[PDB]
Each structure stands twice: as structure tokens, then as C-alpha cells.
Design a protein around this ligand. Structure first.
Ligand SMILES: NS(=O)(=O)c1ccc(NC(=O)Cn2ccc(=O)[nH]c2=O)cc1
Ligand SMILES: [Zn+2]
Length: 258
């Protein structure tokens, strides 16, 4: 009886195995755009993905992860609210059963159809496992998805999903360029938070871009054909794998833009 997104093991149950679920800096949150304060001392984000080396795509039973070689400074996030260099290790998405829900963060209570998370770890801690034990260990770049025009740079991801339908399946996934998933503007909100799945560790500087990307209805429909279950188990569609907004508590969301 492990955690998931069903009626009996979903987000409202997670605190029983992971008491930090009720902690002081949990994610996601609602971004109230009128209360977020412009911080002119924030620097522009630096997204340096030209040398990124993707390796594999994995259905882990909760989402699918596109994994990268993080044994060198190849794809890094710097600047913005960050001190130091954060290396890209994986990206994944959260999405809904319907276009009206799916994102984890919300904007003035608006839910997007999906949300992309590009996960990076602070190189001063040496590896990801040590980084998640630190309050400034991770930087997650969050990007909202709305349904409209197709995102051409997403299609290579969509087309491999048939090969990783069920939990525990992986496939080679080399030469994928995550620059094709970015919007035009890098304007962002930022706040201190957590992993949005167990173990819910309070180790993330969240950087959420204001500009969503557009994906097509056909692209998101293919996300919804994935399975939470393993092969040869009863089919449960991988949909609504999002945690709802958590209390902001004693935190301020800062904006990079006026
Ligand atoms: N929704 S989230 O807050 O961004 C969030 C982000 C990351 C995690 N955990 C990991 O990444 C662990 N890990 C590490 C290397 C890897 O290759 N694959 C992988 O899974 C959990 C939640
Ligand atoms: Zn995530």
C-alpha cells in the first residue's frame, strides 16, 4: 500500500508515511500574481543547455523521466535567485485527465493542462542524493503547458511513450535537446519549497516561468495513454499525477519582472 494518486493513497494520505507533507515549505503553491513582489536584485536566469546529453526515458510508475548525463557540467542552470551552478539531471511532467487540470502550481488559482519540471542539483554537494538533504540542494525550473498549437520540440518525447507504457519500462533516449521545450521569455517567479512527490524533502528553490508553452491536444492525449501499473497488472491510466497547492505559510513569492 504505497503512495500514489488514487483515492486511497493520494496526496491527502502522504503525511502518514511522510510527516514533512505538513511542513513549513511544501510545494506546489498557488502563485498570487498581485501579492508576488518584484525583486529588482534578482538576476536574469542563465539556462545553458547547448551541451546537454540525454540518455534514457523511464516510466517510474508516477511519471516519466527523461534522464541526462550529470557527471559533468554539460547542461546547467545558474543566475536568477541561485548561488552557484546547478546541473540538469532529469525532466518530467505532471498532467490531468482533462485539459482543465494537471498543473501543480497554479496562477491566481488557474490550473494549466500540465506542468514540466526540469530538475537540477547544486554541484557544491557532489551528487543528487546529498543535494536533496540540503535547503539549497535543488533548483527546479517549472513550465506550464496549455493546449493549443503543437510544440514541435516535444514530439520526440510523445513518440517514444508507446515503448514505456508501463511502470519500470525504459528506453534509450539520446540526443534530445531540452531547449525545444522552453518558452520565449524567461521571466519567472521564485520561492523556497519542496519536492512535490514523496519524500517531499524541503530542498528546492522553485523557479516557475510566467510564459506557458503550447502543446496540442494530440500531444497531451498521448501522455494520458501511459499506465501507472506494471505490465500484466490491471490497467490504470497515468493521469492526474499532480499534487494540489499547499499552504504558503511564512514565505514570499518574488517576481523577476514588473
Ligand atoms: N516533482 S519535483 O518536485 O520536481 C521532483 C523532482 C525530483 C524528484 N526525485 C528525483 O529526481 C530522484 N531521481 C534522481 C535521478 C534520476 O535520474 N531520477 C530520479 O528520479 C522527486 C520530485
Ligand atoms: Zn515534478
Amino acid at each position: 500500500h504505497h503512495w500514489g494518486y488514487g483515492k486511497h493513497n493520494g496526496p491527502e494520505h502522504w503525511h502518514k508515511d511522510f510527516p514533512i507533507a505538513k511542513g513549513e515549505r511544501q510545494s506546489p503553491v498557488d502563485i498570487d500574481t498581485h501579492t508576488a513582489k518584484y525583486d529588482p536584485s534578482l538576476k536574469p536566469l542563465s539556462v545553458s543547455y547547448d551541451q546537454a546529453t540525454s540518455l534514457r526515458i523511464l516510466n517510474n510508475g508516477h511519471a516519466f523521466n527523461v534522464e541526462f548525463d550529470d557527471s559533468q557540467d554539460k547542461a546547467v542552470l545558474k543566475g536568477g535567485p541561485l548561488d552557484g551552478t546547478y546541473r540538469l539531471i532529469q525532466f518530467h511532467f505532471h498532467w490531468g485527465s482533462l485539459d482543465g487540470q494537471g498543473s501543480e502550481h497554479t496562477v491566481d488559482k488557474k490550473k494549466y493542462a500540465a506542468e514540466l519540471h526540469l530538475v537540477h542539483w547544486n554541484t557544491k554537494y557532489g551528487d543528487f542524493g546529498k543535494a536533496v538533504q540540503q535547503p539549497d540542494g535543488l533548483a527546479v525550473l517549472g513550465i506550464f503547458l496549455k493546449v493549443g498549437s503543437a510544440k514541435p520540440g516535444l514530439q520526440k518525447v510523445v513518440d517514444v511513450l508507446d515503448s514505456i507504457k508501463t511502470k519500470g519500462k525504459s528506453a534509450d533516449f539520446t540526443n534530445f535537446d531540452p531547449r525545444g521545450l522552453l518558452p520565449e521569455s524567461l521571466d519567472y517567479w521564485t520561492y523556497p519549497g519542496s519536492l512535490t512527490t514523496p519524500p517531499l524533502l524541503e530542498c528546492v528553490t522553485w523557479i516557475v516561468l510566467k510564459e506557458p508553452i503550447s502543446v496540442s491536444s494530440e500531444q497531451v492525449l498521448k501522455f494520458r495513454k501511459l499506465n501507472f501499473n506494471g505490465e500484466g497488472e490491471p490497467e490504470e491510466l497515468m493521469v492526474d499525477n499532480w499534487r494540489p497547492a499547499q499552504p504558503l505559510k511564512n514565505r514570499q513569492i518574488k517576481a523577476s519582472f514588473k
